[PDB]
Amino acid sequence: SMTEYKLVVVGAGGVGKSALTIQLIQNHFVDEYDPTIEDSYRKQVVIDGETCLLDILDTAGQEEYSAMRDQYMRTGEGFLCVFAINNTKSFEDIHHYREQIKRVKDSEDVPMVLVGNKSDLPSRTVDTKQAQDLARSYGIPFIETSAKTRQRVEDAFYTLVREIRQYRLK
Ligand SMILES: Nc1nc2c(ncn2[C@@H]2O[C@H](COP(=O)(O)OP(=O)(O)O)[C@@H](O)[C@H]2O)c(=O)[nH]1
Ligand SMILES: O=S(=O)(Nc1nc2cccc(Cl)c2s1)c1cccc(O)c1
Ligand SMILES: [Mg+2]
């Protein structure tokens, strides 16, 4: 009695993809994690009374031309789209990840959660209002997280599970 979910964490270099994933799985904050390391992690959790097996891919390279990137966008079921709230360029990158995923899936129906990470940092450059409006225009949830303090990390991944589960009934 268990259901599987394939999750993929994308976003620009340095936004905190690795830090978020490692906090969820190992309960510690990594400060200098080699930015080229790309690994998958499995974790079993209970969400809404369902025992779920999460298979999570922490992506390293974000290159436009990559056969392996095309393969994991084909294989993945939901996408954690991450920007850092102190890096406006990373928030502007989001549009390109969403367009890439839609292309590969040939679909509008794509499970996605927008994540504004580094919420612990006081010098914000991306207004929460702007990030909510972008999420609204995509029809997806929006969550701010801190991989440093562990704020809303479980929340972000479990919200993406709930999105996949709902899309399966449509
Ligand atoms: N203050 C703060 N720093 C973070 C947070 N998440 C990641 N970092 C730092 O930002 C840098 C890049 O994080 P990393 O997870 O390796 O980014 P990736 O390239 O997206 O995997 C590292 O020095 C992390 O410790 C956060 O929530 N708060
Ligand atoms: O051989 S893989 O298809 N393994 C994968 N493992 C996982 C785990 C969770 C979600 C997804 Cl999309 C994947 S894809 C692959 C493909 C491309 C890059 C990789 O690091 C791994
Ligand atoms: Mg990384």
Ligand 2 lined by 75 (C-beta under 6 Å): yes
Listed by start position, the domains of the chain span 3-168
User: What is the CATH code of the structural domain delimited by 3-168?
Assistant: 3.40.50.300
Alpha-carbon dihedral 60, 22, 45, 105, rounded to 10 degrees: -10
List beta partners, residue 51.
46
Residue 28 DSSP symbol: S
Q: CA–CA separation, 57 vs 106, rounded Å?
A: 21
How far does residue 34's CA lie from ligand 3's centre (Å)? 6
Phi, psi of 100 (to 5 degrees): -65, -50
Tokens of 94: 């989001």
How far CA 167 is from CA of 25, 52, 60, 116, in Å, comes to: 25, 16, 27, 23
Q: Report the structure determination method.
A: X-ray
How far does residue 32's CA lie from ligand 3's centre (Å)? 9
Residue with tokens 């991450």: 82
How far does residue 57's CA lie from ligand 2's centre (Å)? 6
Strands 50-58 and 39-47: antiparallel
Q: CA–CA separation, 18 vs 14, rounded Å?
A: 9
Q: What is the edge-to-edge ordering of all strands in the sheet holding 142-144? A: 39-47, 50-58, 3-11, 78-84, 112-117, 142-144
- The experimental resolution of this structure, in angstroms, equals 1.7
Residue 107 DSSP symbol: S
Alpha-carbon dihedral 82, 88, 94, 97, rounded to 10 degrees: -90
Ligand 2 lined by 72 (C-beta under 6 Å): yes
Q: Is the Cβ–Cβ distance between 24 and 52 less than 8 Å?
A: no
Ligand 1 lined by 33 (C-beta under 6 Å): yes
How far CA 85 is from CA of 12, 30, 105, 107, in Å, comes to: 12, 18, 28, 29
Residue with tokens 């929340």: 155
How far CA 65 is from CA of 3, 70, 98, in Å, comes to: 33, 9, 16
Q: Is the Cβ–Cβ distance between 78 and 113 less than 8 Å?
A: yes
Contacts 24+ apart (CB under 8 A), 47-51: 47/158, 47/161, 47/162, 48/162, 48/165, 50/3, 50/165, 51/1, 51/2, 51/3
Q: CA–CA separation, 39 vs 57, rounded Å?
A: 6
Residue with tokens 């994991």: 72
Give the residue among 75, 135, 134, 62 at the shortest CA–CA distance from 104: 75
